[PDB]
Amino acid sequence: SPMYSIITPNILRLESEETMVLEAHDAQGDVPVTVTVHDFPGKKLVLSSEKTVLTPATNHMGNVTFTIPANRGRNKFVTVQATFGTQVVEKVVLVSLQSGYLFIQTDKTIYTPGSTVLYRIFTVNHKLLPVGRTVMVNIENPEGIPVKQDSLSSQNQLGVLPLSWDIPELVNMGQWKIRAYYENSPQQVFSTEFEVKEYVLPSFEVIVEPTEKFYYIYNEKGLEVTITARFLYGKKVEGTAFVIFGIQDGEQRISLPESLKRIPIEDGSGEVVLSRKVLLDGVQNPRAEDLVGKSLYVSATVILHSGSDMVQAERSGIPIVTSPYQIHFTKTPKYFKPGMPFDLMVFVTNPDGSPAYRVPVAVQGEDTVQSLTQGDGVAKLSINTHPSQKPLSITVRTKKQELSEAEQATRTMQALPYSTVGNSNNYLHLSVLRTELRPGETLNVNFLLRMDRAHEAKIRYYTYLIMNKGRLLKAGRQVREPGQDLVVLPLSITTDFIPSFRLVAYYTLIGASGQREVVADSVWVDVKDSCVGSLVVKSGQSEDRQPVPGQQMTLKIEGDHGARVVLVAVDKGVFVLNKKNKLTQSKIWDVVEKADIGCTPGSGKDYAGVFSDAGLTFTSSSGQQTAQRAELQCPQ
Amino acid sequence: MVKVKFDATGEEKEVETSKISAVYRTGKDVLFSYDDQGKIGWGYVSEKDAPKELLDLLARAER
Amino acid sequence: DEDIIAEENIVSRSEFPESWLWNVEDLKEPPKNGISTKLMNIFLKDSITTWEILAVSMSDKKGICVADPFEVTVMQDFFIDLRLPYSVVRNEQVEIRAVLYNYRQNQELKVRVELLHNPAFCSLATTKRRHQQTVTIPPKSSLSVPYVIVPLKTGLQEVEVKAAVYHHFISDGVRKSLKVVPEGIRMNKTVAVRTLDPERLGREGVQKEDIPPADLSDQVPDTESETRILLQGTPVAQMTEDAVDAERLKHLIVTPSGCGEQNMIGMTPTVIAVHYLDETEQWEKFGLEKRQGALELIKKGYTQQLAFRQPSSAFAAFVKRAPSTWLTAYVVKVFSLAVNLIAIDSQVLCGAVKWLILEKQKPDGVFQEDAPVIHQEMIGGLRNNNEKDMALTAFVLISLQEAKDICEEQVNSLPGSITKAGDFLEANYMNLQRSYTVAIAGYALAQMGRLKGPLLNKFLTTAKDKNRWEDPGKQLYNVEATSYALLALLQLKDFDFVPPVVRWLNEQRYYGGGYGSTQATFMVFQALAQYQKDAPDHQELNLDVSLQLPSRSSKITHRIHWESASLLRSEETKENEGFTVTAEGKGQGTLSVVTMYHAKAKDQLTCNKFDLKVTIKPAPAKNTMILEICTRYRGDQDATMSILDISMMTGFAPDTDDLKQLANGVDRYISKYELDKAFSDRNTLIIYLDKVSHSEDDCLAFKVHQYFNVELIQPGAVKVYAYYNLEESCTRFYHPEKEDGKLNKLCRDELCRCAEENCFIQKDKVTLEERLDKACEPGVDYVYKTRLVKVQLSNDFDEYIMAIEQTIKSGSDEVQVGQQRTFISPIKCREALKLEEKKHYLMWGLSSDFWGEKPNLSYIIGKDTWVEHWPEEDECQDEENQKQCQDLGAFTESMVVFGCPN
Ligand SMILES: *[C@@H]1O[C@H](CO)[C@@H](O[C@@H]2O[C@H](CO)[C@@H](O[C@@H]3O[C@H](CO)[C@@H](O)[C@H](O)[C@@H]3O)[C@H](O)[C@H]2NC(C)=O)[C@H](O)[C@H]1NC(C)=O
Ligand SMILES: *[C@@H]1O[C@H](CO)[C@@H](O)[C@H](O)[C@H]1NC(C)=O
């Protein structure tokens, strides 16, 4: 029994090169493989034009890249066939109509009637790479009513569509949408909004933020807030400030009129308080604890000492909380391997869902292993397992020295035992140091084996595959000589592993009951998020002081050679009025973290359940294959 | 005597040094193999909670 | 004065874009240090703020990359921020602050800020006398300068104040435009909502619904009237009864085993299982894997059965049994369109169709039933001994029809055969009883389109109210019979009559796979597969809808159809008229017609939530007047805190001890910052109130002092708003010499010109020599001798109706010597004019002092208008009068006798 394994991504993409992994286990000579792809059902042979011959001089690994073109709820599929001489291995894999992503920049956040809105749509495939499709654009109004429908293709514009819509003077004042979508994919729609309004750029901005980023219900010192007031040109503001507070659960708000306070701005900075007495009275006179899980806002209105100008600004979201911290097992595999060590990826956030740094977190109990949270607000925490196939209930805690034990946040979670072929109680684990990975560093990936000594001779290699942006970034072998219970992989991170990657590994053997067995395990690895390449903008002009109006200066634009850069200056005035729907590389990554065919942090119930759950269709010439993938979204 | 903690319930297995299969290192912490019942069982132990016998068997197999 | 930048030699800051540098500079430069450095010289705008440049990079290698926001900070040691609103109401007097910013470290500057007169604005600025205030600002500080003005001109209009420092070279001029808006308020109004169906409406023609223009009865003059038209073109989805559950179709996947017919009956259903599941793409909920595992079987069943193939290209039951009509006839039909499912030997089929017509059919057009298939239960309702030569012949012709299109080349002799029997089943299929045999034969011809009205509505009638065909017998006989029929209905394309049959099937919930189902099973699911590919939900949509607009010269036609995305075509004229629409095609769209304008004003202005009253009266350095401010909340309960934003009148500042008083108030407070601002240049001031009452009127006043004696002092103002919303608030102005703090302007309905200036020509000093020289300019257009009939002195302008006596130089007014005529003056220009009735008056004036147009046009007295109390002839006999009379008489002749130069 030589075994031929096909590994493709879970859901294939169209008019994109995705790649499938060819392996023959225990294979004499060089084996031939011709990769075929038909429509489902039937036989159009839309991309069978891929051939290869895997050697023992690569130990029978190798792959063929292919692009599925082009055209011809609603769910389309394709049968992928890799025939090794005699033997036929064919899978049916879901296929994404959806071309890629769209991102739409506007020259401002907020516009008057009479002004033109310059907008740009960036046409990029699933791998963040510029493309040439035709895309229609829509400009809905504060009630969706497409008040102009365009349709341009980016061919040879290199991913960038510069458009314009002038706003009529007699326009429906409010919150205007734009809606773009690839001419092929009407369902892959992409939106960015821009407030239309009368207004006039202020003189100064106002920054209100508290001593905290939350209220501790039992902090009798009340929610202290410092106000700041700067002219847009930098110098501080002398004036006076009207600030009022209010609780809100959840959509509805409730102004606390008693909490209305008027304060002078001296050297552009005042300070106002919201007592606990005011808050408690204000609500209902109820019990302070009633109010946890709510949140309050503050609302500063600063008028200059002339009167010429005044500015509104509110800080919302200030949640009222028992514990300065939140522990989420959202990054942590929910499957353990009996006996083998179990790694938790504890994730601690501030109430404002920002990640906590240097937070001692530990398994529940007394003198327990205690790890500290990275900059990621991730700590790791490894815990030894028993050999039993019983469910595992783990509680974590914060161990910060300053916080009372009542004040320490908790969260409980539950891993299920990795199910195993014939109850072979062969397992595989993958350990990794959960620092912050920056590309041009090396990650060491610890392939732990856990089978009985008696069959361990045969385990000669693992096959390791690296998923990135819902596509097989690369894969290969990790050799292991007998009695090598842990082997270590030196993984070189490139500027291609961003914003993260999954690694799924599998050793196979014809062990126990004369039947082939596949063991597998996945791990997700967050990389340090940032630009594939780099771009900067800075003063070509040396030092000077403040560039004087109407004057010329120079701008250094240090960017990736042979790339189209696009600019826009915006008077920071605009961003006092409205600072939402700005484009940040960070918002981009967030998009591609959602579009992950992988839906599990790690591991999975069976061998099969690892591959699907990491976004891969394993399938062999022994009857042994991943469950079929139907849902284009991650089943919730 | 090398001690292996189970922070879930706070149990303690004790492993005989001779029975150990091999000792490996993860950042600070240490991570070795058993011979449970001919099953190649494991055991992680914290830097803080490393006894001398184990650091020794490591520093050998290392340098 | 002097030693100070000349106002005329000051380029002002024009350009204040909110966004710019929309540029798209590529990166091609030699990649030195791993990173292309493009340098870019840019010219900054004059907006004194901080810009935020945000670059995006696009590389076909590196993908996309959003750069971190770079800030640039434009700044200057001294400058004016001209604080405008967004927009002002035409003929609504309002005040604008221009704030001066001395940002020097340790140097006050003696500045002279000056408002530039714009004809589009009424203000204390005018062509002859500018608006200059001199004010020194202390180091690292800003003083506020108010400017009360009236917008008279509609659209965008431009304010332009400037300043220079005395003794130094440091100047700054600004000019921001702002929107001036017509008296009124925004207003939409639905012109029409017609319904767009060419099938029902305007039957058998092109629908032409006659849309009106707008009503626009309230529509303020000179206001754009955009008529928002929209052709929303709806779709319609004709629900189709959807397919049988995969879960019930499990038992139709049988592994074809047996011999000749028993292998065959094995394969029969698993074929049609695939073919259905193919067209209903239900392979998902069934299990994708299960297809190729099942498809395996049909291959094997085809191949196995070929070894039940007699060397006559023919199919027997046993290894060597006497060949069959029907068995062969069937496998012709099952293979017929299992061809798409599995490439089958097109020789073995079309060569097998060839044998059946050759040695099993004669000239009549029938087929022999010497086809004993042992167990005749697969056969269906042909086993029964009625119309066996008439019923079989109809089935066996079916097998020719499915494999008709594919075989018409391999055998050209066969096409002939098909057509010929097509007659023999047309003539004979009228006198049949069994409702089995009625239905098969009905399909056979209907396929070949042979079934028109005559034999259509015999087959049609057998239908049990268009639901089923059947008789008394086996209940699976009726089910296979109903299907055969169905296949016809969608072959002859009667989508009207189809659906309710399909329901009667899904009633029987037939899934087949039981002793004698073979032909029943197949046929059912073939019919329901045909159905689902023929079935329309697509309710034909195609609209060639146009409408030749009166406004635009070029028509607007639109093409809304199905498999078209853009279902919301729309274009918007800015003029309003009625216009018919041409609506032809097929489907259901929507024509709605909306229109926005300026509906006329209700409860007045944006000051109906704060009543206040400003009182300026003198008291018993120089001058000292007491300023009383009386406010009240136009609401249901005492208001919160609120703002008192005061402006002083030109060259004033409040008593420092009278502000001291007010701050120490239980509900009052002024910023010590404004209390420790000495009379320095404190011309703005803010007094904050803790609670304004809705019930009593909370008043209070304080002394002001005349810091500098400059005449023509501008009216002050008092704007009072709640903290939480500036928008809704009432400013009121004040001035000692004026009434309520409004500037003198003659205003006639909507039109408004400005009257802040001299009353007549500012010149007993009355030389005839010169008088006559300055009498004849291109300017002056009317020289009149006249006589005041009546006087109309009142509260507004005071109109003098002046009887024309003798017209010296006539302009553009048809006039006699008797034509009475209206001359209007500002109340203020009473005292200076000192006019009287039935008086000899010389009144030569200037063209475009004409209030309205023929014949309601009225001559206005002007800064360019000239007046003289012409003496009465009979009392010229005075020797201190006779001097004047002469000169006047000297003028009167010398002007009119010849005329003026050219
Ligand atoms: C799937 O197929 C593609 C193309 O065959 C594989 O990419 C190719 O992989 C080879 C070997 O890993 C690459 O060679 C490498 O070159 C780098 C220098 O940049 C060197 O550091 C490495 O040691 C190695 O020799 C080769 O560049 C690359 N070719 C491409 C991308 O065009 C991919 O790895 C295959 N994956 C599997 C699972 O077979
Ligand atoms: C018309 O104006 C009214 C007044 O508020 C508003 O409610 C409505 O949404 C407007 N509709 C359109 C089409 O402008």
Residue numbers in the entry:
A (entry chain A): 1 to 72, 79 to 642
B (entry chain C): 1 to 63
C (entry chain B): 730 to 1349, 1358 to 1500, 1503 to 1641
Q: Any passages from the paper?
A:
Each of the three major complement activation pathways (classical, alternative, and lectin) culminates in the cleavage of the central component, C3, into functional fragments C3a (an inflammation mediator) and C3b (an opsonin). Nanofitins are small alternative protein scaffolds derived from Sac7d, a 66-residue protein isolated from the hyperthermophilic archaeon Sulfolobus acidocaldarius. Compstatin, a 13-residue synthetic peptide, demonstrates strong affinity for native C3, as well as for fragments C3b and C3c, and inhibits both the classical and alternative pathways of complement activation. APL-1030 is a novel, high-affinity inhibitor of primate C3-mediated complement activation developed from natural amino acids on the hyperthermophilic Nanofitin platform.
To determine the binding site of APL-1030 on its target, a crystal structure of C3b-bound APL-1030 was obtained at a spectral resolution of 0.3 nm. APL-1030 binds to C3b in the same binding pockets as compstatin, which are located at the interface between the MG4 and MG5 domains, but does so through different hydrogen bonds. Structural analysis indicated that the peptide residue Trp 42 forms key contacts at the interface of the C3b MG4 and MG5 domains. Additionally, we noted the insertion of the N-terminal β-hairpin of APL-1030 within a cleft in the MG4 domain that is induced by a rearrangement of a loop (residues 370 to 374), which contributes to the larger contact area of APL-1030 (11.2 nm2) as compared with the compstatin (5.53 nm2). Importantly, the N-terminal end and the C-terminal α-helix of APL-1030 are positioned away from C3b and are potentially available for genetic or chemical conjugation with other functional moieties. Compstatin binds C3 at the macroglobulin (MG) domains 4 and 5 within the MG ring, a component of the structurally stable β-chain of C3, as well as its fragments C3b and C3c. APL-1030 is thermostable, binds C3 (KD, 1.59 nM) and C3b (KD, 1.11 nM), and inhibits complement activation via classical (IC50 = 110.8 nM) and alternative (IC50 = 291.3 nM) pathways in Wieslab assays. Additionally, APL-1030 inhibitory activity was limited to the primate sera tested in the assay (cynomolgus and African green monkey) and produced no inhibition of alternative pathway activation at concentrations of up to 1 µM in the non-primate sera (pig, rabbit, rat, and mouse) used in the assay. Thermograms showed a single specific heat capacity peak at 65 °C and were stable for up to 1 month, demonstrating the high stability of the Nanofitin.
